[PDB]
Copies of this chain bind each other. A is one copy, B any other.
Amino acid sequence: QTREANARAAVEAAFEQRVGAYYNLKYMMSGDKDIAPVNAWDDGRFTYFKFSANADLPSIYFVDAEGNESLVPRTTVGSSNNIIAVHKVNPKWMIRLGNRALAIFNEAYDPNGVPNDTGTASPAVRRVNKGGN
């Protein structure tokens, strides 16, 4: 019981460390430009979209090669919930809201990426099988 508190305290700072990631910024957009996020980028693991405070948070869709649209889990983050984050990086993102749709093309898509050997959102926090058994 003594050690677990130490682990929790260390973790709840390691996450906040968050240093040493590469940020891409090469992103094109085309379509219904009214919905367009003000800034979009990716870290190699998560792709971020930032919408202004005055805009609705649309639905963001993952595109395959042939153009079929498919769901991607998303999480809202940021101080003011103005940043929507998806759990993937891809060449082509489709943004839809109501009946106006905007398409996002990634221009520097990397197939290799960064491997997930830590099992978490961080390269500094590991995940262990405490279940043992």
Point out residues on A near B: beta carbons under 8 Å: 32, 34, 38, 44-45, 52-55, 64-66, 68, 79-82, 88-90, 98-100, 109-117
Contacts and interface: CB of A to CB of B under 8 A. Distances in A.
Contact of A53 (B38, B66, B99, B115): B115
Nearest to A110: B54
A44 B116 CA distance: 28
Contacts of A44: 53
Contacts of A66: 98-100
Given A65-B100, A66-B100, A80 B115 contact: yes
B53 A112 contact: yes
Nearest to A65: B34
A123 to B, nearest CB: 12
Nearest to A55: B111
Given A34-B65, A65-B34, A54 B100 contact: no
